[PDB]
């Protein structure tokens, strides 16, 4: 430990402090910028979900699992908390295949169950997601994944309870087949000509995913 080794090392820690201390303030900007994309996605979400409320559409009696994550690091315990929740739900139905959205989360589960993974997404953690991108992702899940056949589909996302705490969240995605067996369906007029249930699935799967990422 010479004066030079301490002077050079002490100087490089100071640089790190400046890099992190500025990273925080910059973070406060992206925080408010993601609030406009968060509130506009929740209010819209409540519009479509209001329908499922007044009209019971629960699932009665192979499974698709999607995990919403980013690809960047230095975010605390976000790639560990989610990779732990999916892990628990995986112990009950190991057969159920998984399609995580994030090269980062991928490696988390790719170690425990490299089988279940059959599709991954990269390049989303960058800026705030939009329906343009969300609907496009959900599109491939119906073309090469064929989610329409899966009886029950589950989604995993992180619900921000506070600025100092987060809560992992899960929300099911009822498919077309589950829209018919809906106890309260007759109350709503509908024509079995325009595949209303069919086109509702391919759309709900997009919005719910967008409200999960945003």
């Amino acid at each position: 430990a010479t004066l030079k080794e301490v002077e050079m090392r002490l100087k490089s820690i100071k640089n790190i402090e400046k890099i992190t201390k500025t990273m925080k303030i910059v973070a406060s900007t992206r925080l408010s910028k993601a609030e406009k994309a968060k509130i506009s996605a929740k209010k819209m979400d409540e519009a479509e979900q209001l329908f499922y409320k007044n009209a019971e559409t629960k699932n009665l009696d192979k499974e698709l699992i999607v995990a919403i994550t980013s690809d960047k690091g230095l975010c605390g315990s976000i790639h560990s908390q989610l990779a732990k929740a999916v892990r628990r739900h995986l112990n009950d139905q190991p057969n159920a295949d998984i399609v995580t959205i994030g090269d980062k989360i991928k490696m988390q589960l790719l170690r425990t169950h490299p089988n279940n993974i059959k599709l991954s997404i990269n390049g989303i953690g960058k800026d705030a997601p939009t329906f343009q991108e969300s609907a496009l992702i959900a599109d491939k899940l119906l073309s090469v994944m064929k989610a329409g056949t899966y009886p029950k589909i589950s989604i995993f996302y992180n619900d921000p309870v506070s600025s100092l705490s987060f809560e992992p969240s899960e929300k099911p995605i009822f498919n077309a087949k589950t829209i018919e067996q809906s106890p309260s369906f007759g109350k709503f007029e509908i024509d079995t000509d325009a595949n209303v249930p069919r086109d509702l699935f391919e759309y709900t799967l997009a919005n719910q995913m967008l409200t999960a990422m945003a």
Binding site: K118, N122, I124, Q132, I137, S143, N195
Partner: protein, 59 residues
């Protein structure tokens, strides 16, 4: 002109109209908010049962 036949999901059916509309307006009243709203750089990759993967492609 079938969309649910050889086209795309309903999410994409309204998508093409979302960009067409957002791009059918004035260039002056087109905030940058809309520009990046139609921009995306995400690629998908299909994996096997043995950590294997397919050739990467654009969404």
């Amino acid at each position: 002109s079938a969309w649910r036949k050889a086209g795309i999901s309903y999410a994409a059916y309204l998508n093409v109209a979302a960009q067409a509309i957002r791009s059918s307006l004035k260039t002056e009243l087109q905030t940058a908010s809309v520009l990046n709203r139609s921009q995306t750089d995400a690629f998908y990759t299909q994996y096997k049962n043995g950590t294997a993967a397919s050739e990467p492609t654009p969404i």
